[PDB]
Design a protein around this ligand. Structure first.
Ligand SMILES: NC(=O)c1ccc[n+]([C@@H]2O[C@H](COP(=O)([O-])OP(=O)(O)OC[C@H]3O[C@@H](n4cnc5c(N)ncnc54)[C@H](O)[C@@H]3O)[C@@H](O)[C@H]2O)c1
Ligand SMILES: NC(=O)c1ccc[n+]([C@@H]2O[C@H](COP(=O)([O-])OP(=O)(O)OC[C@H]3O[C@@H](n4cnc5c(N)ncnc54)[C@H](O)[C@@H]3O)[C@@H](O)[C@H]2O)c1
Ligand SMILES: O=C(O)c1cccc(O)c1
Ligand SMILES: O=C(O)c1cccc(O)c1
Lengths: 342, 342
């Protein structure tokens, strides 16, 4: 109802990252959890005075549960979403939604059939500075987007959230956010992708870096670069605020590295603490409110979908679209040619 | 001799940009000029008490001239270099060397045959911060280059030098970018994929681009440029402008926008006032000396070529190679496909 009664499937790293949000947002009450590990279940029952289960059948069968947050490893998402849906539970599943388009399709179908909402976990494209930059684009204040340039230099490869890195770890985890933000901002279909990955650390035989071109319906183009190898830190270019809102040198908004949106008549630079507008008339630092609850935008989509029936932007269809781009990046770098997106 | 005796062909915008350099560098004496404009000739005779001519035949026939600086519009370069060479004058020609590979070939051949040195005008790849970053890469200190990311957001399209506008921002602006990237990686470009953007009717030329470059040995670069004068990426180069000025009279080095060089074991960020090295052990701001003469690196190549016979890095062959990449960018953007380089 007023307090969304949330069950959690998979009490891992994603869950723990999401916890301050679920704790501090007054719209959420944690009512149950499942986890195959006894020590996680035990932690949760203690922490939230709440029933726990070894699996999703148990969580999904608890009728007090209204919605299930899926933070299990990716290969259980499709199954866990299916079971939640069968039992009339709305679903918030972490990025990645799934690692195949087939899993995603099934997920969409099952939630569609059960008549429950399907929203995809935390993605940085939920972050207020991007929603706000999206608002500018959609307002027509600067005309349509023509070019987007995005870059993130991080230490993901060596100081990550571990179980995400199946090959292309930084694509499915890191490019997911980047592509999502770019899609949010441009607001049209990706039609073509061309990607180069870099992989130059034997100790870490996975792709740690990439550069990609994206062509969008309507003729806007994006370039996105990522480097996970932990040397230069591009938070220097985001007013020295880290990914999770923290100060580097009472939080600010989350972000995913320097991004410049070029509209026909001006540039938008979303920052963790403001949105900078460069138009031919004025140069503007437009203030943002400091978030009281981190990642509250995630809870907004969920709360409004379940309580008010408002179709959420970050649905299954949306997330599957980002997955498809991510698969296309990997195919492009792997094969050395363009991928065309239907 | 000790003072290189320099004739100037074409007293245009390039010349005037180069002038503080030619004035202040003690190795240079301006001894003669040609220009089809009587008012430019008159200005020069007055300023430098020096003989002037309507054309290159006159400048080339002055036997006191040791070297000729060609600052004429591009379509006269090949002819003016041919004539200089015929008369045993060394040649410094502005970027662009020429706009066709045929012109360039002729230029190389003529200077080769006459036994005179051929160097290509100012290019930002001459700038000390890049030479210094090059020194690090070539030293093996951080291992080979694996990735380069370069971007420049400027007001070129609307506040340019103006006789530089086919594909104006490619031949003028991407020339510097590609040159810097070539200098830094230090191997051949093998492949290019480019998108250009052109979204101002009042300015029906390409004002923006993003391109992928593959290099021999597997390094890749991505380069982005946007000339539409909104965001100003000098913000990311310690607020120092292209020509070394402060944008918050001793000045700093010249540059061509934010560049990050990823070597196998570290990143190099060349800045107008330092070279930042991010290696696994330490993060280092390596200081540079403030130049006494702007663009002295250009006079170093010329002076050392003519007086000491040291083959210059920025020769005709080198410059032609950047032109070839630039043609390839335009061909790639213009068509929907990769261009492979010989
Ligand atoms: N690591 C991150 O920061 C992060 C962020 C975004 C999304 N994700 C996604 O969420 C997934 C969950 O892993 P994590 O990164 O949160 O850390 P993690 O591996 O510590 O957490 C996953 C935990 O979920 C539990 N789980 C629940 N149901 C399960 C089932 N049926 N079978 C097996 N285990 C089950 C397991 O005990 C497992 O340890 C990741 O694989 C990734 O796909 C992770
Ligand atoms: N505009 C710049 O700042 C800049 C920078 C780098 C290189 N360049 C290159 O140098 C070229 C020179 O133009 P500019 O931009 O310096 O400005 P500009 O057009 O003011 O100067 C070029 C002048 O050279 C003179 N000239 C000399 N010999 C000539 C000849 N044989 N025929 C005709 N004119 C002759 C002309 O009077 C002409 O006006 C440009 O076209 C460009 O290719 C320009
Ligand atoms: O959504 C997240 O929790 C997250 C945070 C860090 C990186 C990543 O892959 C995802
Ligand atoms: O090399 C130059 O003199 C120059 C100066 C500014 C920008 C440009 O296109 C070229």
């Amino acid at each position: 109802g007023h307090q969304l009664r949330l069950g959690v499937a998979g009490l891992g790293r994603a869950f723990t990252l999401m916890l301050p949000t679920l704790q501090q947002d007054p719209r959420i009450k944690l009512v149950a959890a499942c986890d195959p590990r006894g020590s996680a279940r035990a932690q949760f029952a203690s922490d939230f005075r709440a029933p726990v289960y070894p699996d999703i059948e148990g969580l999904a069968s608890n009728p007090d549960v209204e919605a299930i947050y899926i933070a299990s490893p990716h290969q259980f998402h499709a199954q866990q979403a299916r079971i939640a849906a069968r039992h009339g539970k709305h679903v918030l599943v972490e990025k990645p939604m799934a690692l195949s388009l087939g899993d995603c399709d099934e997920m969409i179908q099952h939630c569609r059939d059960a008549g429950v909402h399907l929203i995809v976990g935390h993605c940085h494209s939920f972050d207020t500075p991007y929603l706000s930059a999206r608002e500018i684009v959609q307002s027509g204040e600067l005309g349509p987007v023509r070019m987007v340039h995005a870059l993130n230099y991080t230490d993901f490869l060596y100081r990550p959230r571990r179980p995400e890195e199946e090959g292309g770890g930084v694509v499915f985890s890191q490019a997911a956010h980047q592509v999502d933000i770019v899609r949010l901002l441009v607001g049209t279909r990706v039609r073509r992708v061309r990607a180069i990955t870099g992989d130059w650390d034997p100790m870490r035989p996975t792709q740690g870096a990439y550069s990609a071109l994206l062509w969008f319906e309507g003729g806007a183009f994006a370039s996105i670069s990522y480097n996970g190898y932990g040397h230069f830190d591009s938070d220097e270019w985001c007013d020295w605020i880290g990914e999770m809102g923290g100060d580097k040198s009472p939080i600010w908004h989350q972000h995913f590295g320097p991004i410049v949106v070029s509209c026909e008549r001006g540039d938008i630079r979303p920052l963790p603490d403001s949105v900078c507008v460069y138009a031919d008339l004025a140069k503007e630092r437009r203030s943002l409110q400091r978030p009281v609850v981190p990642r509250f935008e995630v809870i907004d989509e969920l709360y409004h979908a379940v309580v008010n029936e408002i179709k959420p932007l970050h649905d299954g269809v949306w997330a599957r679209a980002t997955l498809e781009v991510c698969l296309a990046l990997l195919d492009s770098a792997g094969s050395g040619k363009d991928v065309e997106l239907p």
